[PDB]
Design a binder for this molecule. Sequence first.
Ligand SMILES: CCC1=C(C)c2cc3c(CC)c(C)c(cc4nc(cc5[nH]c(cc1n2)c(C)c5CCC(=O)O)C(CCC(=O)O)=C4C)n3C
Lengths: 213, 216
Amino acid sequence: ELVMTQTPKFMSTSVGDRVSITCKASQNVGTAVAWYQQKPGQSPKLLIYSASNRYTGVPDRFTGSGSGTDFTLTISNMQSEDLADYFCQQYSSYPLTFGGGTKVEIKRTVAAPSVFIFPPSDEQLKSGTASVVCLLNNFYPREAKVQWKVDNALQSGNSQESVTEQDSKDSTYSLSSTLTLSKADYEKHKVYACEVTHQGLSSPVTKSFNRGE
Amino acid sequence: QVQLLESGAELVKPGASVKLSCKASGYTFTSYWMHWVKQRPGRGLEWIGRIDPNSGGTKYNEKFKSKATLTVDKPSSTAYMQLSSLTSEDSAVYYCTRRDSDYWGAGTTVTVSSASTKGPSVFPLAPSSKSTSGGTAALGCLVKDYFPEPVTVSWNSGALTSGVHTFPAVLQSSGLYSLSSVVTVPSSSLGTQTYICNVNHKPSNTKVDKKVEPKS
Ligand SMILES: CCC1=C(C)c2cc3c(CC)c(C)c(cc4nc(cc5[nH]c(cc1n2)c(C)c5CCC(=O)O)C(CCC(=O)O)=C4C)n3C
């Protein structure tokens, strides 16, 4: 199928800035490309079709351009109401395919996350599973790397991450990484550490505890 | 005005099938093709196929060839998409949209799970003791193994809102949901100020109040 590669995945901006989003086609699609905007809990909304045709009702702020294999969606004089996801789509050939999307967010100064780690608590153990939680609080930008290490052993496939949307007041993010394992495994080891890497930190921050305090 | 009315939300058990609806109005149903699209936060948007309401002719994305079946009912001006033998991979929001994608349905969220209504378990995320004297500590409640959605969390019956972060519910390899709610407070209030998370799970008519304090 024709693959539409969309960049950037994320883009932070300030009111009035110009936003530029790109979609590259694996093969020529002429000018059969559309651009859409999508906000949480809503269906996509058509912005541009035929690569540069602004759909009825769409603000002059939105301009589509390009042809062949290189397409651009430009949002001049960015407004707060433009904070949303944007997707391109080619309809030159079947199957129709969509770009991976770009989430336009609010720019602010870099802020390092405050890290905290939480033990499973005896109460949960009774369930048979142990949950270890790591918290990255109020950081920016969203890019963050969290690594779990049990007794200095890098974990894989047993953790899940959740991130909040930008705070309405300070525009930061918060993230939780939860390491799930059986009580058996949890009791087998002693050292539990959460190592965090973020643009705002001059070096990785590690928070840890030893089972049984 | 043109409108495409979709189901909204469907719960499907693994292996079962579900038929989604998309009722058209405000225009002549048979004059425009109808597209169906799938959306997952990770996979993104995918074109499933299209159907010409006038002829019944269809075209599918190879990826959904054995998964979706598109049909229409002229009398009711409604388009349908049959999704068969579902797995967790099929959980997503499905939309129907007219030929030019100028008009879209609101989307039908499909959740594939074998779980039955179940209230959440609530565990304390205790404040680190003898941690940072920076006057700021973090504590919270781990809300896990509940079904279906949603669950709400407040602190001290709503009196505490500043610094509260309640994370989006994630899915575990069990078919049950889980999430944490945290809050940062003055490291000087610990031991003196009481912190209680109020968890409500309307689906099971279950509510939990849990005091989170330093562990002994
Ligand atoms: C989802 C992608 C998509 C976008 C975005 C799109 C945009 C679009 C709009 C919206 C403002 C309008 C009025 C037309 C405008 C048109 N669009 C089409 C025809 C099509 N347009 C299609 C797809 C398509 N069209 C497809 C697929 C067909 C073929 C289906 C068919 O056989 O009718 C026609 C021809 C139909 C006719 O009058 O015989 C016009 C005019 N198209 C090009």
